[PDB]
Amino acid sequence: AMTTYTSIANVIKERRSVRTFTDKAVEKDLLIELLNDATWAPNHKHREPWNCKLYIGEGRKKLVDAVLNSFTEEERAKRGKILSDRFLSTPAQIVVYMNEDPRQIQRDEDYAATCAFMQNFQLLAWERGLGCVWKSGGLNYNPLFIEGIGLTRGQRIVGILHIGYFDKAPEGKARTPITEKMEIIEG
């Protein structure tokens, strides 16, 4: 019996966005376990701004219905079936949202915290062999989709995480050395 002492550096660097999943079953209790660990994200004044909708199994069709009903007839003709088939061969979706504070600093802080929570989650999931992609784009800003999944105005969708077990890790893309993006002032 050997316990492993993996540097979190390894997880951070090995994590990949995964967009295609095996038909292996993702346990709900595992996702809840991971999300609970993710809640240890920094968050100003302990506002804990993050909230979630988890769509799994038959429920995923409800999300799909909200997605499709939000498209113009042209988008829908283009991506409807494609996207429906994709969502339905993805074990879980997690819509991550927050109440939008009318004030810049508090909203930015909340959004920062909500992104830290999602990144935590992605790291936590990678560790157990779960892949995921953090989705954005115009769908998340579409008032038709937002009402369609039961959110009110002034609730912001930070991301939709698509999650499941996967066959092969996608390849990485080399990062720019931080020294090209930084000034050092030892002046």
Ligand X SMILES: Cc1cc2nc3c(=O)[nH]c(=O)nc-3n(C[C@H](O)[C@H](O)[C@H](O)COP(=O)(O)O)c2cc1C
Residues engaged in binding ligand X (CB under 6 A): 16-17, 19, 42-44, 46, 109, 112-113, 116, 133-137, 159, 170, 172-173
Nearer to ligand X among residue 25 and residue 66 (C-beta)? 66
Stretch that binds its own copies, among 18-26, 59-67, 71-79, 80-88 (CB under 8 A): 59-67
Output the residue with the shortest Cβ distance to ligand X. Answer: 42
Q: How many angstroms separate the most distant Cα atoms in the chain? A: 61
Q: Is 175 annotated as a binding residue?
A: yes
C-alpha dihedral, 114 to 117 to 123 to 128, nearest 10°: -130
Nearer to its own copies among residue 21 and residue 91 (C-beta)? 91
Q: Are strands 130-135 and 51-56 parallel, antiparallel or unpaired?
A: unpaired
Q: Is 7 annotated as a binding residue?
A: no
Indicate whether 147 belongs to the interface with its own copies (CB under 8 A). no
d(CA 61, CA 79): 15
Annotated binding-site ranges: 15, 17, 19, 43-44, 135-136, 175
Annotated binding-site ranges for FMN: 15, 17, 19, 43-44, 135-136, 175
